[PDB]
Amino acid sequence: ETFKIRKLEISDKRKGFIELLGQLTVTGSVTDEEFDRRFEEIRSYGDDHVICVIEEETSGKIAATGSVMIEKKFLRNCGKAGHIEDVVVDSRFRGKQLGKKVVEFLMDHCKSMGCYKVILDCSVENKVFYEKCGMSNKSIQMSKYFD
Amino acid sequence: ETFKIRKLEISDKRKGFIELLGQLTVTGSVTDEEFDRRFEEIRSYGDDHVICVIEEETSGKIAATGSVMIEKKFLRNCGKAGHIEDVVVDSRFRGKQLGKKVVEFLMDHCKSMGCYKVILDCSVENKVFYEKCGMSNKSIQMSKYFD
Ligand code: NA
Ligand code: NA
């Protein structure tokens, strides 16, 4: 196995991208039409919304992924914060240090865009993983689903 | 005292908006030029990035504020999640139920836009406040500042 890190491309709909997201949470059965629609809506944000993928070359499937959306604010001298989302590594490839590579790629992008911070939410069990990526836990997440 | 809830407007730079944000965290001394630049960059996102303010009428200053940025995803059938940010109530006006009004305004906007959830981060001490707004705490926030 060999791993290539890069951004999501429109052809990744045939490389198990949506299937890998399904290891994080419900995707539904996303059609090619819908995949392309939402790919172009995200591409429209340019550098303010980046999806990283790692492809495993032999299988030609996506092995890991993570996203970041840059939020412009008024505080912090009209600063910018990165929100890292949708980080998932295929269970087959856990222990291969792919999730760190994804997170670092997105942190590198946000530092380069002049963000003052990056944040993400995780389970209590995954705190120590993200501490290894230089992060700290000082707040909690609240959520409301419109189920 | 009388309170009017609405969206941020370009004239709010003269109504203590940036001063109120300074009760949450560092703003720096944001110029009118920079305020207008960043107001128009956020306005450009339309319904995908809403800032709510509550003005206290007698003083004509902003008494509370909160923001939401809608993130488009591929999971959840190409769903949308609302990220509520930058929620702050002037210390003078705490106990007047303004923060609930702000949060509910932003949740109402996200439900109307078809989001499947809304999330935000808070201190452990403020968990119970947000539980009163119908939210639940099941994850933690990790952060990295580029200080
Ligand atoms: Na923004
Ligand atoms: Na988006």
Coordinates of C-alpha atoms and ligand atoms in Angstrom, one line a residue:
Chain A
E1 CA 0.0 0.0 0.0
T2 CA 1.0 3.5 -1.0
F3 CA -0.8 6.8 -0.1
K4 CA -1.2 10.0 -2.0
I5 CA -2.4 13.2 -0.3
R6 CA -4.3 15.8 -2.4
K7 CA -7.6 17.7 -2.7
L8 CA -10.9 16.2 -3.5
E9 CA -11.5 15.9 -7.3
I10 CA -14.7 15.5 -9.3
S11 CA -13.7 11.9 -10.3
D12 CA -13.5 10.9 -6.6
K13 CA -17.2 10.0 -6.8
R14 CA -16.0 6.7 -8.4
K15 CA -13.2 6.1 -5.7
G16 CA -15.3 5.4 -2.6
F17 CA -15.4 8.9 -1.2
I18 CA -19.0 8.8 -0.1
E19 CA -18.6 5.2 1.1
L20 CA -15.7 6.4 3.4
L21 CA -17.8 9.2 4.7
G22 CA -20.4 6.6 5.7
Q23 CA -17.8 5.3 8.3
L24 CA -18.3 8.7 10.1
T25 CA -22.1 9.1 9.8
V26 CA -25.1 8.7 7.6
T27 CA -24.6 9.7 4.0
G28 CA -27.6 8.4 2.2
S29 CA -27.1 7.0 -1.3
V30 CA -25.7 10.2 -3.0
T31 CA -26.2 10.2 -6.8
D32 CA -23.5 11.3 -9.3
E33 CA -25.8 14.3 -10.1
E34 CA -25.9 15.4 -6.5
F35 CA -22.2 14.7 -5.9
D36 CA -21.3 17.0 -8.8
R37 CA -23.8 19.7 -7.7
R38 CA -22.4 19.8 -4.2
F39 CA -18.7 19.5 -5.5
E40 CA -19.2 22.6 -7.6
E41 CA -21.0 24.5 -4.8
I42 CA -18.0 23.8 -2.5
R43 CA -15.4 24.5 -5.2
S44 CA -17.1 28.0 -5.6
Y45 CA -15.6 29.0 -2.2
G46 CA -12.1 28.6 -3.4
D47 CA -9.5 28.6 -0.7
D48 CA -12.2 29.3 2.0
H49 CA -13.4 25.6 1.8
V50 CA -10.8 22.8 1.2
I51 CA -11.5 19.0 1.2
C52 CA -8.3 16.9 1.6
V53 CA -8.2 13.2 0.6
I54 CA -5.7 10.5 0.7
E55 CA -5.9 7.9 -2.0
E56 CA -4.5 4.4 -1.5
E57 CA -2.9 3.8 -4.9
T58 CA -3.1 0.0 -5.3
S59 CA -6.9 -0.1 -4.6
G60 CA -7.5 3.3 -6.1
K61 CA -10.0 4.1 -3.3
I62 CA -10.0 7.0 -0.9
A63 CA -8.4 5.9 2.4
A64 CA -8.8 9.1 4.5
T65 CA -10.5 12.5 4.3
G66 CA -11.1 15.8 6.2
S67 CA -12.4 19.2 5.4
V68 CA -11.9 22.8 6.5
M69 CA -14.2 25.8 6.1
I70 CA -12.8 29.2 6.8
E71 CA -15.1 31.6 8.7
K72 CA -14.5 35.3 8.5
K73 CA -15.2 37.2 11.7
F74 CA -15.1 40.8 13.1
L75 CA -13.2 39.9 16.3
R76 CA -9.5 39.2 16.2
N77 CA -9.0 42.3 13.9
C78 CA -11.4 41.0 11.3
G79 CA -9.8 37.6 11.7
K80 CA -10.4 34.1 10.1
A81 CA -11.0 30.8 11.9
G82 CA -10.7 27.4 10.3
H83 CA -13.4 24.8 11.2
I84 CA -12.0 21.3 10.5
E85 CA -14.9 18.9 9.8
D86 CA -15.7 15.4 8.4
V87 CA -12.3 13.7 9.4
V88 CA -12.5 10.0 8.8
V89 CA -9.9 7.2 8.1
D90 CA -11.0 3.9 6.6
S91 CA -11.0 1.3 9.4
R92 CA -8.7 -0.9 7.2
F93 CA -6.1 1.8 7.3
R94 CA -6.1 2.8 10.9
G95 CA -2.7 2.9 12.6
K96 CA -1.0 4.2 9.3
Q97 CA -0.9 7.8 10.5
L98 CA -3.3 9.0 7.9
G99 CA -5.5 11.0 10.1
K100 CA -2.6 13.1 11.4
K101 CA -1.5 13.7 7.7
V102 CA -5.1 15.0 6.9
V103 CA -5.3 17.2 9.9
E104 CA -1.8 18.7 9.3
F105 CA -2.6 19.4 5.7
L106 CA -5.7 21.4 6.7
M107 CA -3.9 23.2 9.5
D108 CA -1.1 24.1 7.0
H109 CA -3.7 25.5 4.7
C110 CA -5.4 27.6 7.4
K111 CA -2.0 28.9 8.7
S112 CA -1.2 29.9 5.1
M113 CA -4.5 31.7 4.7
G114 CA -3.8 33.8 7.7
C115 CA -6.3 32.2 10.1
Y116 CA -5.6 32.9 13.9
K117 CA -6.9 29.4 14.9
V118 CA -8.4 26.1 13.8
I119 CA -11.0 24.2 15.7
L120 CA -12.8 20.9 15.4
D121 CA -15.0 18.7 17.5
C122 CA -14.4 15.1 18.5
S123 CA -15.3 12.4 21.0
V124 CA -13.8 12.5 24.4
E125 CA -11.9 9.3 23.4
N126 CA -10.2 11.1 20.5
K127 CA -8.8 14.0 22.6
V128 CA -5.4 12.4 22.9
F129 CA -5.2 11.9 19.1
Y130 CA -5.7 15.6 18.4
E131 CA -3.4 16.6 21.2
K132 CA -0.7 14.8 19.2
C133 CA -1.6 17.3 16.3
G134 CA -0.8 20.3 18.7
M135 CA -4.5 20.9 19.8
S136 CA -6.0 21.5 23.2
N137 CA -9.4 20.9 24.7
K138 CA -10.9 23.8 26.6
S139 CA -14.5 24.0 25.4
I140 CA -17.4 21.6 24.7
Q141 CA -19.6 21.1 21.8
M142 CA -23.4 21.6 22.0
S143 CA -25.6 20.4 19.2
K144 CA -29.3 20.4 18.1
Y145 CA -30.5 18.1 15.4
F146 CA -33.7 18.9 13.4
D147 CA -34.5 15.2 13.1
Chain B
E1 CA -35.1 49.4 28.4
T2 CA -36.6 48.0 25.2
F3 CA -34.9 45.4 22.8
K4 CA -35.2 45.0 19.1
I5 CA -33.9 41.8 17.4
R6 CA -32.7 42.0 13.7
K7 CA -29.6 41.4 11.5
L8 CA -26.4 43.3 11.6
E9 CA -26.5 46.5 9.5
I10 CA -23.6 48.6 8.1
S11 CA -24.5 51.4 10.5
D12 CA -23.9 49.2 13.5
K13 CA -20.3 50.2 13.5
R14 CA -21.5 53.3 15.4
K15 CA -23.6 51.3 17.9
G16 CA -21.0 49.5 19.9
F17 CA -21.0 46.2 18.0
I18 CA -17.2 45.8 18.0
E19 CA -17.1 47.0 21.7
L20 CA -19.6 44.2 22.6
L21 CA -17.6 41.6 20.8
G22 CA -14.7 42.6 23.0
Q23 CA -16.7 41.1 26.0
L24 CA -16.1 37.7 24.3
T25 CA -12.5 38.0 23.1
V26 CA -9.9 40.3 21.6
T27 CA -11.1 42.5 18.8
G28 CA -8.4 44.9 18.3
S29 CA -9.3 48.5 17.3
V30 CA -11.3 47.8 14.1
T31 CA -11.5 50.8 11.8
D32 CA -14.6 51.9 9.9
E33 CA -12.8 50.9 6.6
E34 CA -12.1 47.4 7.9
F35 CA -15.6 47.1 9.4
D36 CA -17.2 47.9 6.0
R37 CA -14.8 45.6 4.2
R38 CA -15.6 42.6 6.4
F39 CA -19.3 43.4 6.5
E40 CA -19.5 43.3 2.7
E41 CA -17.4 40.0 2.6
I42 CA -19.9 38.4 5.0
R43 CA -23.0 39.9 3.3
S44 CA -21.7 38.3 0.0
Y45 CA -22.6 34.8 1.5
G46 CA -26.2 35.7 1.7
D47 CA -28.3 33.4 3.7
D48 CA -25.3 31.0 4.3
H49 CA -23.8 33.6 6.9
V50 CA -26.2 35.5 9.2
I51 CA -25.3 37.8 12.1
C52 CA -28.1 38.6 14.6
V53 CA -28.0 41.6 16.8
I54 CA -30.3 42.9 19.5
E55 CA -30.3 46.7 19.9
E56 CA -31.4 48.3 23.2
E57 CA -33.4 51.2 22.0
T58 CA -32.9 53.8 24.7
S59 CA -29.1 53.7 24.6
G60 CA -29.1 52.8 20.8
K61 CA -26.2 50.3 21.5
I62 CA -26.1 46.6 20.6
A63 CA -26.9 44.6 23.6
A64 CA -26.4 41.0 22.3
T65 CA -25.1 39.3 19.2
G66 CA -24.5 35.9 17.6
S67 CA -23.6 34.6 14.2
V68 CA -24.2 31.4 12.1
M69 CA -22.3 30.1 9.2
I70 CA -23.9 27.4 7.1
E71 CA -21.5 24.6 6.0
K72 CA -22.4 22.5 2.9
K73 CA -21.4 18.8 3.2
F74 CA -21.5 15.6 1.3
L75 CA -22.7 13.5 4.2
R76 CA -26.3 13.6 5.3
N77 CA -27.5 13.5 1.7
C78 CA -25.5 16.5 0.7
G79 CA -26.7 18.2 3.9
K80 CA -26.1 21.5 5.6
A81 CA -24.9 22.2 9.1
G82 CA -25.2 25.5 11.0
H83 CA -22.1 26.7 13.0
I84 CA -23.3 29.2 15.7
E85 CA -20.4 31.5 16.6
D86 CA -19.6 34.7 18.5
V87 CA -22.5 34.7 20.9
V88 CA -22.2 37.5 23.5
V89 CA -24.6 39.5 25.7
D90 CA -23.5 42.8 27.3
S91 CA -22.8 42.2 31.0
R92 CA -25.2 45.0 31.8
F93 CA -28.0 43.1 30.2
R94 CA -27.4 39.6 31.5
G95 CA -30.6 37.9 33.0
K96 CA -32.8 39.6 30.4
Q97 CA -33.0 36.4 28.3
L98 CA -31.3 38.0 25.3
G99 CA -28.9 35.2 24.6
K100 CA -31.7 32.7 24.3
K101 CA -33.4 35.1 21.8
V102 CA -30.2 35.3 19.7
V103 CA -29.7 31.5 19.7
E104 CA -33.3 30.8 18.8
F105 CA -33.2 33.4 16.0
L106 CA -30.2 31.6 14.5
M107 CA -31.6 28.1 15.0
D108 CA -34.8 29.3 13.3
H109 CA -32.8 30.5 10.3
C110 CA -30.9 27.3 10.0
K111 CA -34.1 25.1 10.3
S112 CA -35.6 27.3 7.6
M113 CA -32.6 26.8 5.3
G114 CA -32.9 23.1 5.6
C115 CA -29.9 22.4 7.8
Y116 CA -30.0 19.0 9.6
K117 CA -28.2 20.3 12.7
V118 CA -26.7 23.3 14.4
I119 CA -23.6 23.3 16.6
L120 CA -21.7 25.6 18.7
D121 CA -18.9 25.5 21.3
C122 CA -19.1 26.8 24.9
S123 CA -17.5 26.6 28.3
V124 CA -18.4 23.7 30.5
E125 CA -20.2 26.3 32.8
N126 CA -22.5 27.3 29.9
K127 CA -23.7 23.8 29.1
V128 CA -26.9 24.2 31.1
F129 CA -27.7 27.5 29.3
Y130 CA -27.6 25.8 25.9
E131 CA -29.5 22.8 27.2
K132 CA -32.3 25.3 27.8
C133 CA -32.2 26.1 24.0
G134 CA -32.8 22.4 23.2
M135 CA -29.1 21.5 22.7
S136 CA -27.1 18.5 24.0
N137 CA -23.4 18.0 24.8
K138 CA -21.9 14.9 23.3
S139 CA -18.5 16.0 21.9
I140 CA -15.6 18.3 22.9
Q141 CA -13.9 21.1 21.1
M142 CA -10.2 20.9 20.2
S143 CA -8.4 24.0 19.2
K144 CA -5.0 25.2 17.9
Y145 CA -4.1 28.9 17.8
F146 CA -1.4 30.2 15.5
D147 CA -0.3 32.8 18.1
Ligands
NA1 NA -16.9 33.7 5.9
NA2 NA -20.4 25.7 2.4

